[PDB]
Write a protein that binds this ligand. Structure first.
Ligand code: NA
Ligand code: NA
Ligand code: NA
Ligand code: NA
Lengths: 472, 472, 472, 472
């Protein structure tokens, strides 16, 4: 429903409380560090109004059209529709934008369908879902706790906790270490870390406008690099930004509270509501798109330099193909095996999604490595468009050709491969893939604990009956 | 349709021309090296008559019942039925029997449905399919060419070639290096290696009874070890055997010829007919069953020795779970994306099956390693059931307990884990998984060449338009 | 000093209390399961009297000649001499015999040189060293504790503990899970597992003749396979055997007690005495020899089948070469950086030896994999010498040739490659390399804790001074 | 001998013909993109005059003092001295400067000692060595050939070739794709790629001042990022730069020609002269220093966030320790096994150096990965020193602490870890380690071909005699 113009106007009128290198960012839509991603998100919103993609990206309901990521799926076909929307948006940025709002709309959609889970705060959840849906707003998630130097009563508000409760709502103080893509209208403070018994003061779930007084987003090093599409094909447009989120006695209205002082409710929220399943559904579609981009670049690089005649290179590209097919397989099974949860919400299969989200963090570094191995040293000496336009341009056109590519074309392609792997932007993507869904160690331990291993244990026990029978 | 008794009687009456350590095997049904696998195959046939599995393992047609692996699938549901049959049979032997006849029935079924591919030999193919189906016979595939010492006119019949053609059929001479599970009624001489231009004399496809004069199967080292289910839980029953296949001027009746002197027809047979797709479908179901067995053993081992409290061990088991889910995903997508080929035969998706068959050979050695890492040195000092039954039995019961298992139970379980990984039988399984479908290097190069990489290359080319536009 | 004949006579006269499949082994020198390794150890002893190797394998002292592994090294040259002896013995069996007595003589030699460490039991240690040296006896180490099923006062003697102390010595009861190469005159009960506070009853170190009443060695599955050098080139001669060691109220004379009820002394024994350093020195020489054998086989296999023309194969062999050089490097630095410990005993560098023993367990599975990848399916269908000698021999000679090898030669070579990797014997070698020195997880944690990381931390702290200076 | 001031004055007076983004660089000593590395190289030169390091970094000869990397070693002690100098210089920049001039001085030193190899150009080589030594100049190597688009007589001067020969010297035209650290007085055009028969026009070896008319160095993307030591601890000072090198009818005086039109001489130059051995000696010392830096950072990171209590983290740090010890071992053996080559030049052992240079390219990506795994998401949201100095500084000091570190200290450390791995500078280091010495595929094939595998093949042949004897 939202247009790119509406999104841009919203951030310009009520900008997120962003700070960059010790200074407040007055207008992120024009600031050199953020204007690129803002334009990109704006383009994602505009695509919703392109007739060619209207049916893929939006659905009609009572005379209004809403983004597909808000659709509460009733059938497997509806799930497929949500998946197609995730994929189309992902493809626009070669799967490089990892925290586009549809992944969180998936979470809020599930929370709302499973609103009974929240008890007294159920209506708050349903109303918030309707607000985000109707206004088609952008969201960001603030997660991870700070640490305290115990080498130095103690301050109980380092991590975000409730200072007090009033007739208007709750006052919170503390910080969240990470919020990716802060160019949003709203920030969600939902649990991503297990809470131990006694941590009620920190067991909260709520949402706030990003301009809320007392709320501050502190940026890390900008990885944009430049505006030239030739020199910085990806960083010039898909640099989402990561930030520290500070809560200085922030007032959270009661209407925006979803969970308050309940350890168990927080710990089981994502799984019980189905938010885990739906957000992971967006993720598998996203990573399929990302892998497709790497396959395309690898294939073009190999052909462009005539390296495709080498068995070694063909094998590496085939390896990327195997991984692409693995991700497509997880995506297909996630949808085909979907079943309704305790609240009647159809959710994609967790086994398939757990497989995808626990395997891709291992596959990605290898996919990145493969591109480095194909490009080799050719990725480390790429000139700028300015050099082609300068006095030595003629020399560059004569010396920077590929076995099957003209100079400008080869450099444009290798600059993209470089931006996908070795630029500050590209390297960040690696760290991001390794950890965005959580620490792999914890994720694997979680998978071990939740998985029903009984059918297999029983089959082996049955098979061993003949072994123990020798003693009869 | 066939019963275990009928299969046993068939091999006893007309045994395959098997040789073991320089001597002819008169009765494989009673010989210590082969009676185990014979009994196992017999049990697979008997299961077809168990009312609980009749509908899963067989289908009715004109008053007769045939094995499900012969069913020419018309719908995705039919494909699912074939898959369920592959899985049920596989589960009986923990996915350790890698060349049960249903994988080749899948090949012959596809050949028959796509019989037009064979031209003048089309009816031969259809009739052979009907013969195998009606009699429910067991088959084995003889593949791989011998080498010739060129450090020594030359003998043109080292690999299997046509010596002459007569009114009765063709006379062939040469050898195939491998035939796994030779306890079969028939041997298929189909192409698995690419033929170069000019190799018409070797471009053949035919089938023969395993007792055919001039045909000899020479066995390698027996890996059975013993008959005790406790000491040798798997090798005592699932040792399929591998053999060299010699053709000493063997007469092949014209009715058994499917391809004669046609290089192109041989090279495209498996892909064009859909045999590749259907055989790979049996394989993915089989490997899913195999992975489930490893998961069960790993889980029981960890719990039995209290190692499940270690994060490291939980992580390794979760890794097996990720691989199990990956294989289930490939299997699901293979069926859901199925489409009809040029001959109207519904075939499971090759992308998904290529992913599965090119990934599992890499996953298996790791799955095996994980079991070794969980069992550790505990896998290297396992006593025999005879020691428990001997004078020191009481000591063993007191000293060989697991943190949560009695001695006999722990040893029975570890003996199984050992037989699945470190016994001669278990180690062979590793080599087998690495190469049964082909040399990974060639397989990956084949995947690279057949895969349509254009959609991805086009997306990147489109994305790079903005890069090259800077020069406008 | 000892001859093979003396060793054989010793085991025949006073055989270790060995049990195989519920029965006592009366004469291991003639028993089919043990005669091979007995002959091999005998050959190692005989080599000491070959004039060509006398100076490498023995040293003279006061009119007597002793095995080099007993030499207390005073100079780096002496260390080199010990290394050359380790290497020569290792080479005789292609580095496949992993527990030849010289590795334990290294331990006892260090214990004796550092005898003061043992306090009141110091003379016992010195005298035992002299006994083993003078008689040139063979030893085996019994290690690892049993577990107790807590799913079932408790029996405090599952692991080996002291039941009582008398005027004659101590009475022990319990079991050790592993003893490799039990074809020895003596068994050492030394600590390999960390002891916790309060475990004094189990903190012991002593030695006993293997025929001691109450002592029982229970064998696991025999991996010999056969006596044919062609069919079983390694298992027929280097199958050391592993066994469970039972202590049924065994009396240990006071003269054979080295540590009694001292937790700290046990925990620091190997490191403080230098036994760790010297035993690891034997190990690095041993693994260098083992890697050389794999390199030789891989090279001959590649050349024999003409696979050496493939870049992929050359790369795999070069990988083995890199690992061989790494091990040679660790060995060289271990000797060149040697320094005296607290007791004045020259000990090889622990940093280099810790690197070698923590890296090889990871390199070995890959070296094994490489051989499997070069041999491929050719390793799974190897006939017996009996087939070459049988009626089909002529066919085998014509069909089993290598691109540059005659049939018998290729099969002999591949049978060796198979015995080094896929036979029960070969697969055991893999598990053995992964764990013989300890659980890698514990070994790496031990390395982390003992390593002086301060120099590096200090360099970084110094480098960061400029970073923090920006706030001045 | 040279001081930092002399080096700076030299580049300012006669600057290399550098181009950055289409413009000539007039003064690299003050240009924001190059002043950092210039200052760093200057500091390396100044260290030579610090009394504490004078004996390590320089040697006296006839009243003059020269850089240690010019010393022609006569004894193993001399080799050790060269190694200590390589190490001290490397440590100043945490092993991040990969092309400091001493690695090329090692090449020129070897060329000079083995000058007879060059025939008629021998005196040219000796004189050039003396020139570089006496003036203590900095050098850079221009390598790798361009490609030609054959999808488009042909221009025979794409790669560097001789256009004509005159009484003054030779005129060359073409390009070299890479030259790292162009902030040098001289550029060496030596062979790094195998030349095929008939490529005489391209088989050349010569040296030129970097300001030579017709010579142009074209820079790739600057990776400096910023001058703040806090925000960019490494990129602000060790960004060496990589560039394309253009030769536009450049005149090379005869005195600067070392090899002219000789394919074989070029192909065997590095190996025959010993340049390969000596340059690889600098490399192993360099990588040992680099690994020590990673160990220090990893250790400080783990302790700083209290992650050192996790077994997983301890294991990863121990892994870095194993790799550090491996590199130290290769370095030690390279020196201890040194022998004189055909020209009487003592050269470090190639086996050890081939092991080091072929293993480190595989170890480095893992070492980098380990740092990413320890720092995790904490590496992706690091604020700037400007944020600590800004209005929100107090909040940052309260929320960015480590379990055992104050905020500024933790961020300074993590910023360093980030700059070593994920910044554009850090990621480039990864690609650089993977390929600076050559394509691993070619390097491994070269190792396979040059290594004497006969001793191992012979040992196996001898061992197999017993196998073939069964047929006697
Ligand atoms: Na730029
Ligand atoms: Na047995
Ligand atoms: Na045998
Ligand atoms: Na900056």
């Amino acid at each position: 429903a939202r247009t790119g113009a509406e999104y841009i106007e919203a951030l310009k009128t009520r900008p997120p409380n962003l700070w960059y290198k010790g200074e407040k960012v007055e207008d992120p839509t024009t600031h050199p560090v953020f204007r690129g991603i803002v334009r990109t998100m704006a383009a994602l919103y505009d695509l919703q109004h392109d007739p060619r993609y209207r049916e893929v990206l939006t659905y009609e309901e009572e005379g209004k059209r809403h983004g597909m990521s808000f659709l509460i799926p009733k059938t497997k076909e509806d799930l497929k529709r949500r998946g197609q929307a995730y994929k189309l948006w992902a493809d626009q940025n070669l799967g490089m934008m990892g925290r586009s709002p549809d992944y969180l709309n998936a979470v809020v959609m599930a929370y709302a369908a499973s609103a009974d889970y929240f008890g007294e705060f159920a209506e708050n959840v349903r109303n918030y879902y309707r607000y985000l849906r109707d206004q088609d707003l952008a969201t960001t998630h603030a997660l991870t706790n700070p640490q305290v130097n115990r080498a130095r009563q103690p301050d109980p508000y380092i991590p975000v906790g409730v200072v007090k409760q009033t007739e208007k709502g709750i006052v919170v103080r503390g910080a969240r270490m990470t919020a990716t893509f802060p160019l949003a209208d709203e920030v969600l403070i939902f649990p991503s870390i297990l809470l131990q018994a006694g941590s009620e003061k920190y067991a909260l779930a709520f949402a706030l406008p990003t301009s809320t007084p007392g709320l501050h987003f502190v940026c890390r090093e900008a990885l944009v690099g430049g505006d030239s599409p030739f020199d910085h094909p990806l960083s010039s447009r898909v640099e989402e930004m990561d930030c520290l989120v500070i809560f200085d006695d922030v007032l959270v209205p009661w209407e925006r509270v979803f969970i308050l002082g309940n350890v168990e409710l927080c710990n089981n929220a994502y799984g019980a509501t189905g938010a885990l399943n739906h957000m992971a559904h967006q993720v598998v579609a996203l990573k399929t798109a990302k892998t497709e981009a790497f396959l395309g670049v690898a294939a073009l690089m190999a052909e462009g330099i005539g390296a495709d005649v080498y068995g070694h290179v063909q094998e590496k590209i085939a390896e990327i193909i195997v991984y692409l097919e693995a991700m497509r397989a997880f995506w297909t099974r996630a949808e085909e095996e979907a079943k309704e949860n305790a609240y009647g919400l159809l959710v994609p299969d967790r086994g398939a999604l757990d497989g995808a989200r626990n395997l891709y963090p291992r596959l990605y570094p290898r996919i990145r490595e493969i591109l480095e191995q194909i490009g080799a040293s050719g990725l480390i000496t790429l000139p700028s468009e300015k050099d082609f336009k300068g006095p030595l341009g003629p020399f560059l056109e004569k010396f920077l050709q590929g076995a099957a590519l003209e100079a400008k074309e080869r450099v444009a392609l290798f600059r993209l491969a470089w931006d996908m792997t070795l630029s500050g932007f590209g390297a960040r993507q690696e760290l991001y893939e390794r950890f965005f869904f959580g620490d792999p160690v914890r994720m694997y331990q979680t998978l071990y604990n939740v998985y029903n291993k009984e059918p297999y244990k029983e089959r082996i026990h049955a098979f061993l009956k003949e072994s123990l029978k020798v003693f009869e």
